[PDB]
Amino acid sequence: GPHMSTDYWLNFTDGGGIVNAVNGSGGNYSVNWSNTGSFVVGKGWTTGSPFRTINYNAGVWAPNGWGALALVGWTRSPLIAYYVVDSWGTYRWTGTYKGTVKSDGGTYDIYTTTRYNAPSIDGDRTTFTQYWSVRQSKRPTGSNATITFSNHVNAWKSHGMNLGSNWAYQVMATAGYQSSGSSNVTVW
């Protein structure tokens, strides 16, 4: 797989509440958020790859409510958002259950959902399918961790979940919805 450090900084908020993101040095970033709408912040790559290995270390992981410490990315053709969720806050991300995949010392549940009239890389009010791998139990944080994304791509394919042909961003993110928290993450 590719061996390139990060080149992309993502800082998205729909404007609800407070999302105080810091674009740190190298692969490092932090977020403190409060009473938010929908947001996603992270570091990664402008063009995703199905062969990338993402390394990270979350030195601070302190979400509440809906929060996700997750690989986040998109394809176009078709427009699909995907997620590999290693940890979360109060509520565990789920959807339509498809199966499981083992990767990087964890077992992940595979889900699909669909969003309507929602923000995406194509506009503020769009419809798109979402593919999820969600760890069955929260991954420990504070030590170096790996996501071998190809294992997820392959398992998704085995359940009829095919990604699009045009790769957009691919980041190791802090995402949340209607919540509050803190994170500090370094990505490579």
Author numbering: -2 to 185
Wording from the paper:
Fentanyl is a potent agonist of the μ-opioid receptor (MOR), with an affinity of approximately 1 nM and a potency 100-times that of morphine. Custom-designed ligand-binding proteins offer the possibility of both detecting and counteracting toxins such as fentanyl. Following the placement of the hydrated fentanyl into the binding pocket via PatchDock, RosettaDesign introduced 9 mutations to the Fen49 scaffold to optimize the protein–ligand interactions. Fen49 was designed to bind a solvated fentanyl.
We solved an atomic resolution (1.00 Å) X-ray crystal structure of Fen49 in the apo state, one of the first examples of an original (non-optimized) computational design that has been structurally characterized. The structure reveals a highly preorganized binding cavity (28 of 30 non-alanine/non-glycine side chains within ~8Å of fentanyl adopt the designed rotamer) and an overall structure in very close agreement with the design model; the r.m.s.d. of the design model to the parent structure is 0.26 over 184 of 185 residues (TM_align score of 0.99). The Fen49 apo crystals were obtained from a condition containing 25% polyethylene glycol (PEG) 3350 as the precipitant. During model building, a well-ordered portion of PEG was observed in the binding cavity. Soaking experiments with fentanyl tended to crack the crystals and destroy X-ray diffraction, likely as a result of PEG being displaced from the binding cavity. This, coupled with a lack of alternate crystal forms, prevented us from obtaining a structure of the parent Fen49-fentanyl complex. The Tyr80–chloride interaction observed in Fen49* is mimicked by a Tyr80-PEG hydrogen bond in the Fen49 parent structure. Purified Fen49 displayed an affinity of 6.9 μM for a fentanyl-Alexa-488 conjugate by fluorescence polarization.
